Design a protein around this ligand. Structure first.
Ligand SMILES: [Zn+2]
Length: 257
């Protein structure tokens, strides 16, 4: 029953999911002056040329674009990672207004939205086994700011009318997630968690420094989605973000000087 409503939002999650008060929770504020440049970090390798998108789903919390993850098609490697991580889905978090929406913050700056590309470690065989391990997942986070349109986002925006409510899905083949990346792959990294219940502490976060630009119209169309199911009282799908959580005994590392 968790959500982002007036009585089931992030501040209530800990009652069903006590790990919400744990030691490695996400997101966090990235204090750029305390993050350490780590010259041992490698460039990120994002290999999406063979990615196979399948479907887009409104799950009641966000929409997920799902991929075929039964072979090494779309993988993330390098950076802080050991081994190979396969893309399973991406989704976004966004606000009701342009001044909030992101989950991670940068020196307390909130962006309008955040993209998460979720990948699982192939040495565990499946996503459900991977989430039980401290190196199971790698999530690439990309901030969105409102300005110029992102051409490679428009196919996502145009299908949202067809998945307005919880439990609706649409065929979403042939989408190229390379079109959602910024120019630079400089990043920050730290060990954390899923940002939705069950909030499992299985994620190596890789948060890009350079935001992508989207238009005001593109984000406006995200905000016309619904959290509810068909025929239920309309609840616009906005402010589906968890606020920043305590960093505790963790180090944020930067890939760049
Ligand atoms: Zn997310």
């Amino acid at each position: 029953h968790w959500g982002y409503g007036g009585h089931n939002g992030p501040e209530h999650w800990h009652k069903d999911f006590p790990i919400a008060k744990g030691e490695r929770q996400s997101p966090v504020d990235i204090d750029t002056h305390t993050a350490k440049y780590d010259p041992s970090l490698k460039p990120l390798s994002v290999s999406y040329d063979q990615a196979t998108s399948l479907r887009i789903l409104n799950n009641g919390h966000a929409f997920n674009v799902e991929f075929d993850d039964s072979q090494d098609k779309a993988v993330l490697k390098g950076g802080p990672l050991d081994g190979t991580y396969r893309l399973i889905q991406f989704h976004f978090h966004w606000g009701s207004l342009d001044g909030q929406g992101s989950e991670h913050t940068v020196d307390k700056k909130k962006y309008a939205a955040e993209l998460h590309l979720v990948h699982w470690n192939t040495k565990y065989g499946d996503f459900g086994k991977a989430v039980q391990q401290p190196d199971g997942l790698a999530v690439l986070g990309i901030f969105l700011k409102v300005g110029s349109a992102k051409p490679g986002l428009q196919k996502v925006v145009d299908v949202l009318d067809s998945i307005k409510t919880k439990g609706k899905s649409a065929d979403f083949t042939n989408f190229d997630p390379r079109g959602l990346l910024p120019e630079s792959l400089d990043y920050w990294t730290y060990p954390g968690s899923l940002t939705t219940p069950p909030l499992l502490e299985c994620v190596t976060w890789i948060v890009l420094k350079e935001p992508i630009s989207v238009s005001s119209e593109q984000v406006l169309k995200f905000r016309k989605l619904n959290f509810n199911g068909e025929g239920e009282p309309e609840e616009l799908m906005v402010d589906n973000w968890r606020p920043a959580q305590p960093l505790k005994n963790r180090q944020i590392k930067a890939s760049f000087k």
